[PDB]
Design a protein around this ligand. Sequence first.
Ligand SMILES: Nc1ncnc2[nH]cnc12
Ligand SMILES: Nc1ncnc2[nH]cnc12
Ligand SMILES: [Mg+2]
Ligand SMILES: [Mg+2]
Lengths: 236, 236
Amino acid sequence: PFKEVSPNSFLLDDSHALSQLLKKSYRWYSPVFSPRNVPRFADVSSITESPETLKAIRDFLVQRYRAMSPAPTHILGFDARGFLFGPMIAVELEIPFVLMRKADKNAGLLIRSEPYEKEYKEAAPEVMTIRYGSIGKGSRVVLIDDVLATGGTALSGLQLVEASDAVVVEMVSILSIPFLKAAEKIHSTANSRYKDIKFISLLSDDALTEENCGDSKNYTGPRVLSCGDVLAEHPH
Amino acid sequence: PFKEVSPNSFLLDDSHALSQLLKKSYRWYSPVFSPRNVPRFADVSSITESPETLKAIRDFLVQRYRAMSPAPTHILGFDARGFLFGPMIAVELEIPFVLMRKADKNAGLLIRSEPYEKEYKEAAPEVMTIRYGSIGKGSRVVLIDDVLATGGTALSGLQLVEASDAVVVEMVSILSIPFLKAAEKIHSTANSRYKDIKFISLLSDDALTEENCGDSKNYTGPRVLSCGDVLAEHPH
Ligand SMILES: Nc1ncnc2[nH]cnc12
Ligand SMILES: Nc1ncnc2[nH]cnc12
Ligand SMILES: [Mg+2]
Ligand SMILES: [Mg+2]
């Protein structure tokens, strides 16, 4: 079951088989071995490449929503890591999977989000969109992405669902980074207007240790190799 | 069943329930209503938002690979639309789902593709990657994306799989644009080196008509609206 770690922010109890499997499967990488400048970049591939882990996530969330009342009407996944988990859940629940993407990636008449201004050195906010009418009045939307870090896109999701005259069921993530206080900030911003938004995570990055480090030890070459270079390494 | 429309390029017979469902569900948009400058941009959302269609695709491809011999060992999906279909198939087949993304989106030691030089006015080629070792020697990889248009990323997929000392089972797409001759070009380029690569599609864009047009008729406003603008349209 989900335990309330802070107001309206829940974490799957670590005794659960899914929590255990995630802790076992996850691999994180330091800057020199990752695409982002964060201490530990939790690779979604370590999850999607693990058949047992992917199935465990699918089974758990599907059961969750089938048991939920009133049931969700839509799953809204974030480009692109949310696309990895949303469709496999939506296909079972037999509900639409909507895509939240930047305007230059989405088709049709779109609705764009209104991110807050950045905070000195703090990365630039992304304007995200959904096609106008993809979610209608009365819709109960489940928001999904792999990692809840700063929560910028999570906020875009909330804005888009509200503007659509719909309600957010909950913001779900495979992994949360509690240190970044995304849930805390979203729950207090603009006079606690999103105080009632529920956040659920399957694993906290605090559960990840050095055993989860995917960095190549004692490696001194480049991070990226060309196919030609790799081809030369074996008889072909 | 799949019919050979040209050498090593197969199209699902249009009598099939899946082909029919795709023709019914698909929605395309003209430039003023899309993010790309192509006559008819086939929106992947028209597929993912259709529960019955998404399930039909999942069921069909899963059955295909379970019946296949030797069976595929990996599913490699293209960022980001391939991420929408790959995981739901891989979870059933209980095999890894690998991600092909640009270097600045992927983690770990990566292998990058070597795209051909562009052709006057013809859009710039994308260097794509996969984590080194995500696919090993002996792996039989199924490549997936939603639309097979120019085939630039398809070629990146082939290069990455070959460099990994693995073999491509087939390049699968929900929709193909035969006019762009991606399969034909890939099958002849570099002295027919990829002649044996199989391409399969579930629907040809030739099946899409004006009835599939998602453009707002007699509309004169902007393509993108802000949440604030949409909020003003209803009581809140
Ligand atoms: N995968 C990830 N791990 C840690 N912080 C992140 N911020 C954004 N993506 C992240
Ligand atoms: N969705 C799409 N439809 C038509 N041509 C495309 N080229 C790239 N994506 C396309
Ligand atoms: Mg995001
Ligand atoms: Mg592509």
